[PDB]
Amino acid sequence: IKEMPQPKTFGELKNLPLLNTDKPVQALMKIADELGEIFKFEAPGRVTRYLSSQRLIKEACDESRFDKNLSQALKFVRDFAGDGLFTSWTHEKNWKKAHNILLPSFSQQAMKGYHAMMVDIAVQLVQKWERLNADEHIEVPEDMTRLTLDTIGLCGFNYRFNSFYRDQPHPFITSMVRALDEAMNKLQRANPDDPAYDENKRQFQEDIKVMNDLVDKIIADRKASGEQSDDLLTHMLNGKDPETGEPLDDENIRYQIITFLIAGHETTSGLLSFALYFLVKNPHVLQKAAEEAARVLVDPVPSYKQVKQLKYVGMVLNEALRLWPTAPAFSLYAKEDTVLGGEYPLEKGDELMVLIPQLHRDKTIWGDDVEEFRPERFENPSAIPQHAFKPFGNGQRACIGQQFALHEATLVLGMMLKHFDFEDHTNYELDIKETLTLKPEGFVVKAKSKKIPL
Ligand code: COH
Numbered sequence: 242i243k244e245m246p247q248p249k250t251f252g253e254l255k256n257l258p259l260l261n262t263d264k265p266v267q268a269l270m271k272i273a274d275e276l277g278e279i280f281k282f283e284a285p286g287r288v289t290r291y292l293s294s295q296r297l298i299k300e301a302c303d304e305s306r307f308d309k310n311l312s313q314a315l316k317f318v319r320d321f322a323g324d325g326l327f328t329s330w331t332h333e334k335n336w337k338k339a340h341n342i343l344l345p346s347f348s349q350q351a352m353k354g355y356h357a358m359m360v361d362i363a364v365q366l367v368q369k370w371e372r373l374n375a376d377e378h379i380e381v382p383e384d385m386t387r388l389t390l391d392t393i394g395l396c397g398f399n400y401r402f403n404s405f406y407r408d409q410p411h412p413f414i415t416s417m418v419r420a421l422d423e424a425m426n427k428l429q430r431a432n433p434d435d436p437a438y439d440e441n442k443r444q445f446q447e448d449i450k451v452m453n454d455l456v457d458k459i460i461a462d463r464k465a466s467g468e469q470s471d472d473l474l475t476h477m478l479n480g481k482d483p484e485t486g487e488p489l490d491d492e493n494i495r496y497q498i499i500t501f502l503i504a505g506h507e508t509t510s511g512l513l514s515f516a517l518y519f520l521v522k523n524p525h526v527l528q529k530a531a532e533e534a535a536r537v538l539v540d541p542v543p544s545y546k547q548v549k550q551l552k553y554v555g556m557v558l559n560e561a562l563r564l565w566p567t568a569p570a571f572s573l574y575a576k577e578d579t580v581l582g583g584e585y586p587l588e589k590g591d592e593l594m595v596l597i598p599q600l601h602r603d604k605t606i607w608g609d610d611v612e613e614f615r616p617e618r619f620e621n622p623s624a625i626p627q628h629a630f631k632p633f634g635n636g637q638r639a640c641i642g643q644q645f646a647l648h649e650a651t652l653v654l655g656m657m658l659k660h661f662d663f664e665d666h667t668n669y670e671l672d673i674k675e676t677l678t679l680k681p682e683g684f685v686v687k688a689k690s691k692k693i694p695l
């Protein structure tokens with residue numbers, strides 16, 4: 242039975258001021274480097290424990306002992322993602338109902354059906370870049386977000402945000418981003434009911450209304466038409482949970498759509514942005530991935546099968562997920578009194594935070610080179626111990642979108658590497674901006690066309 246380390250305290254505010262920062266995940270990583278595999282974090286009226294080691298996270302991932310907790314971050318997002326899959330408790334009837342209905346819509350097999358719509362958006366990204374003039378550069382996170390948002394819009398509910406036709410996001414996106422920013426800011430806001438925050442609350446309600454209005458209208462229009470499409474909204478209007486025999490109601494479908502649109506934004510586009518960052522910083526790795534793309538993508542437009550045979554591109558994406566997982570933490574609660582790692586007694590209800598970027602730098606798993614970008618780490622995945630690699634979270638509460646996110650990312654990166662040579666023309670210095678997600682802020686490149694027609 243061991244005493245848990247704790248970072249520096251601030252009198253009555255305990256550890257709370259350590260998260261008064263624009264880069265809290267990066268701050269928590271530096272604390273874990275100091276204190277090790279577990280530390281207690283106290284604030285007025287709360288305590289959580291940050292885990293960093295495969296040794297302890299493997300136990301945290303035991304679903305008989307720990308279930309998904311809603312972090313305060315998830316509680317603030319629930320104000321507009323409701324009881325969709327991401328912001329629901331496991332015990333809420335709408336979680337297991339939506340999970341049973343949606344799982345078949347998100348399988349590897351279902352990706353054959355979305356492939357043509359994903360190609361639509363990937364081809365718009367390639368044409369944009371083919372159409373840049375000689376002096377011009379690419380705003381990498383900006384264009385990856387254009388693609389990932391439009392891909393989930395079109396595959397989700399046959400809706401075109403037409404992001405590649407715009408400088409200003411679509412109205413829905415400006416409201417969604419400002420709602421997400423507001424939810425994230427409330428984490429650091431003392432005395433939120435202070436009348437100084439009156440204007441935030443009125444703006445928050447307006448943005449929730451914008452989102453509900455557009456999504457409720459797309460649902461009503463689809464039901465009003467009877468159209469059957471290749472999209473999640475068809476699967477949700479038609480589907481019945483085999484357990485309860487019930488369908489989702491229109492309110493819950495709205496929450497699922499809002500949830501997928503949150504995910505399909507900078508959380509997916511972050512993976513592509515980090516991947517391209519690592520590739521331009523590791524020209525030998527970029528060359529190997531470009532060689533695979535030229536070898537495999539022999540057709541004007543890539544096939545589902547051809548994306549599956551981009552094995553080294555998939556390893557590149559897993560290595561980017563290792564170093565900078567774009568959904569960098571998740572929360573758990575103890576189902577019963579239990580002892581973590583033979584050393585740390587927990588009571589029923591006690592919270593754990595999994596610090597994924599820190600798990601992914603466990604030298605006992607990965608060896609001494611943990612800071613190196615080496616996709617070849619992933620050549621034999623059977624060698625990876627249980628729960629060592631967790632960018633999509635854990636168990637029944639793992640990312641439902643994982644096969645979607647990886648198919649889109651492998652397709653797009655494949656096509657980028659087939660069509661263009663890349664230049665790190667600014668010698669970009671990595672600056673990771675933390676919102677809901679992580680991104681390489683200001684990451685810019687030049688793309689020189691290889692002049693291969695679509
Ligand atoms: C279109 C939908 C979609 C996409 C593209 C997507 C793409 C990605 C993505 C891209 C690289 C990453 C790193 C993640 C990472 C995660 N996703 Co998603 N997710 C998506 C839909 C979801 C949903 C829905 C959940 C909740 C699943 C559940 O609990 O039933 C989810 C859960 C997660 C969790 C668990 C959170 C927790 O609190 O435990 C992580 C981590 N993620 N996701």
Ligand SMILES: CC(C)C1=CC2=CC[C@@H]3[C@](C)(CCC[C@@]3(C)C(=O)N[C@@H](Cc3c[nH]c4ccccc34)C(=O)O)[C@H]2CC1
Nearest residue numbers: 260265266287312313314315318428429570571594676677
């Ligand atoms: C919505 C999804 C995509 C997200 C999940 C997250 C999980 C953990 C979060 C998060 C990374 C944002 C920064 C704080 C952090 C690390 C956290 O521990 N947060 C704890 C502890 C905490 C911080 N501030 C608080 C204020 C009140 C209560 C708890 C807290 C929490 O939210 O619960 C955040 C990103 C957004």
